[PDB]
Structure 1
């Protein structure tokens, strides 16, 4: 079962999410990203189970990636759902910052405000190898 779950906003972070997957697999990690490992069945159950199964939760914070979480108090947004699962389960959450603006916590639903308290890694286009090396040091 995967060591690492990658959560991302499809319309803005898909390329970086894919790049992270490639690098982490090259360094020996088993990685869940939906387009490679989400298979048949009711995707709500399968996605939550896949977050639960992975020790590490890598969150791709592209610009505006949490915008659709705002006021989503019924937890219908999928990045919101994945984050709440990771927080509840006490996962090793590793945010990756790629143009993300740090919001005031009160714009987010209470059940995910804690995601902002985890130390995030800045994605450097100029120093990608060093960024990847730092991500690997953060993983368990």
Structure 2
């Protein structure tokens, strides 16, 4: 089972999520990202089991990444779903900040406001090797 689940917003974080996958695999981690390891069957069940399976939950916060989570109180947004699973399983959540404006907790559904309590890592375009090293230090 993968050690790392990468959760990301497809319309804005696909490239950074892919770059994280390559680097983490190079440092010996088993990584789940949907486009490489989400395979056949009902995706809702597979996505949840994949979040549960990985010790680490790497959350890619590209600009606007949580916009579709706002007022999603029925929890139909898939990043929202992935965050709730990670929170309820007590995963090692590692937010990666890439030009993301932190929202005030009151704009998010109650069940994911806790994601704002985890220490995040700032993605540095100028110092990417060092960013990668700090992420690895955060992984369990």
Q: Distance in 1 between matches of 2:41 and 2:128?
A: 36
Q: What is the match of residue 14 of structure 1?
A: 14
- Partner residue in 1 for 2:122: 122
Deviation of 1:90 after TM superposition, in Å, equals 0.1
Number of corresponding residues: 140
Which digits, 9 at most, give the CA deviation of each residue in 1:74-123, with x for residues without a partner?
Answer: 00000000000000000000000000001110000000000011000000
Structure 1 segments (4+ residues) deviating >3 Å: none
Deviation of residue 61 (structure 1)? 0.1
- Partner SS, residue 86 of structure 1: helix
C-alpha deviation, 1:64, in angstroms: 0.4
TM-score of the superposed pair, with normalisation by structure 1: 1.00
1:24 deviates by 0.1
- The SS at the match of 2:114 is helix
Query: Which stretches in structure 2 are left out of the alignment for 5+ residues?
Result: none
Structure-2 separation of matches of 1:102 and 1:36: 29
| Matched position secondary structure for 2:59 | strand
Helix, strand or coil: the match of 2:29? coil
**Is 1:82 the equivalent of 2:54?**
no
Unaligned runs of 5+ in 1: none
> Any idea what SS the aligned residue of 2:129 has?
helix
Q: Following the alignment from structure 1 to structure 2, what is the Cα–Cα distance between the partners of residues 70 and 121? A: 23
TM-score (norm 2): 1.00
